[PDB]
Amino acid sequence: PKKIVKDAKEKLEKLLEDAKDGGEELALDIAEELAREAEKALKELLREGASPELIVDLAETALRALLEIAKDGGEELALDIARILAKLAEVALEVLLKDGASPKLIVDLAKTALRALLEIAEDGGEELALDIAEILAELAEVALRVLLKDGASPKLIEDLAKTALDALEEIARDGGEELAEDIDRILRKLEKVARDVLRKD
Amino acid sequence: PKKIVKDAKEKLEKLLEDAKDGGEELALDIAEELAREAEKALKELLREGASPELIVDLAETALRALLEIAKDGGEELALDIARILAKLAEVALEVLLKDGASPKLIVDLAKTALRALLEIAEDGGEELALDIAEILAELAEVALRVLLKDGASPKLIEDLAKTALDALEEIARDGGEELAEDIDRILRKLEKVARDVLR
């Protein structure tokens, strides 16, 4: 429980200290080891009956640790970290659903992961921004369907949807016309998914 | 978390074995000691960061333990256990809301408690039935408002409302005409409560 979280954050901080300003090829291996250590600790918290708030805490700590590795590195590494970050965010959201988490805690973790991806796209170039926008939209769809399965209200589902739609618009503001319509098609698909999830609710 | 539940259930079972068919007057004190021990363990699970499923398990175990004391006793004791059972269920529902539980788990615990009260009105007189229904309607309102605070959907909220309204109609069935209109006044007040929460 509380003992599992302390051991996990200690391993994450030590993993984060390594390969940070120490090599791109090593940072990718360290990040995959950081994401695996987080995934095992999340599954461990689920087995031992931990609160959803502890699960959110450990998950957010891991996502921010991956975020720091992606920023100070190249765009090739940033896309690799963002794919790892979104996959870890999926596992954490699935764990919260199995642990019986509230809609609000699912929204919090989802927003933390969406802002982290947005933080990578704004810092990078235009081709990277489109790659992050597609990753962000897929993760947003996963979170919206997790909220639906958890019993969330249309208010919170529409809330998480707007945050993801705003994040996609925020990427297009600092881009050319070619990037705008490449994000506009992503926005229409995410609005379609959000409309379907809300109609079932 | 898992360590707290095992110690609590062992205390509840031993407390239940005592005064089960064992004196009524002691059973009421044992039941108050039973609900007090469960309420302290539920607060303990919240402080140590326990999962909502562990809180539901311990709460349902305590509610059923009270249910056993109420059935093999008299109607006066059955009403006393039902008030204790409803108060404990309210604490457990609030603990679930503070712990970050899902709306489904809140609905599950609420239904367990509403059925436990209905089972006490079962095989009881009409005077006890009306007293149980008033307790059931109040606990139903508590659970519905907790569901709203937890971000529950209209489907889950309307589902819990249907269960509570159906439970009131089951009490009216096989009852006197004087009991039916007494339940009918309770049904209409729970209906507007559900409409206000659903809006």
Residue numbers in the entry:
A (entry chain B): 1 to 201
B (entry chain A): 1 to 199
What sentences appear in the manuscript?
To generate straight, linear THRs, we set Δθ to zero. This results in perfectly straight repeat proteins in which each repeat unit is translated but not rotated relative to the previous unit. We tested 33 linear THRs (with Δh = 0) with helices either about 20 or about 40 residues in height; 23 of 33 tested designs were solubly expressed, and 13 of 19 designs analysed by SEC were primarily monomeric as designed. Structural characterization of the linear building blocks by X-ray crystallography individually and/or cryogenic EM (cryo-EM) in the context of assemblies (see below) revealed that both the detailed internal structures and the overall straight linear geometry were successfully achieved.
Here we describe extendable linear, curved and angled protein building blocks, as well as inter-block interactions, that conform to specified geometric standards; assemblies designed using these blocks inherit their extendability and regular interaction surfaces, enabling them to be expanded or contracted by varying the number of modules, and reinforced with secondary struts. We construct twistless helix repeat (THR) protein blocks from identical straight α-helices (typically 2–4 helices in each unit); the length of the blocks can be varied simply by varying the number of repeat units. Using X-ray crystallography and electron microscopy, we validate nanomaterial designs ranging from simple polygonal and circular oligomers that can be concentrically nested, up to large polyhedral nanocages and unbounded straight ‘train track’ assemblies with reconfigurable sizes and geometries that can be readily blueprinted.
